[PDB]
DNA sequence: CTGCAGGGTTTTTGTTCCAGTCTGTAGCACTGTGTAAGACAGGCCAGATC
């Protein structure tokens, strides 16, 4: 049914790839 | 109910390469601190003996 995931500031900067996609796109379009 | 097997899942974590851009290091030929006396030999003039 998915997966529990701990908070972001403990993950590597890389770990991120998944989270900002939509914001990178929205700022670009903007 | 349990146990673990072995699949589903999302989500780490990293993967290959080509433009570059920054950053730290090795490459450069090359530098600083050792620093003052005496000992031994030979000559020979002085100077005292006598």
The nucleotide closest to A8 (CA, C1' atoms): B12
Which experimental method was this entry solved with? cryo-EM
In angstroms, the first-to-last Cα distance of chain A is 35
Question: Tokens 């991120």 identify what position?
Answer: A16
Nucleotides in chain B near protein beta carbons (<7 Å): 8-14
Cα gap A8→A5, rounded to integer Å:
9
**Residue A28 has which token pair?**
């670009």
Residue A2, helix vs strand vs coil:
coil
Task: Provide the b/e sequence for A1-30 (b: ≥16 CB within 10 Å).
Answer: eeeeeeeeeeeeeeeeeeeeeeeeeeeeee
Resolution (angstroms) equals 4.6
Q: Are A20 and A27 in contact (CB under 8 A)?
A: no
Residue A4 beta carbon within 7 A of nucleic strand B: no
Residues 6+ apart with CB under 8 A from A16: A8
């Amino acid at each position: 049914g998915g997966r529990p995931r701990q908070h972001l500031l403990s993950l590597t900067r890389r770990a991120q790839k998944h989270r900002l996609r939509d914001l990178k796109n929205q700022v670009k379009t903007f």
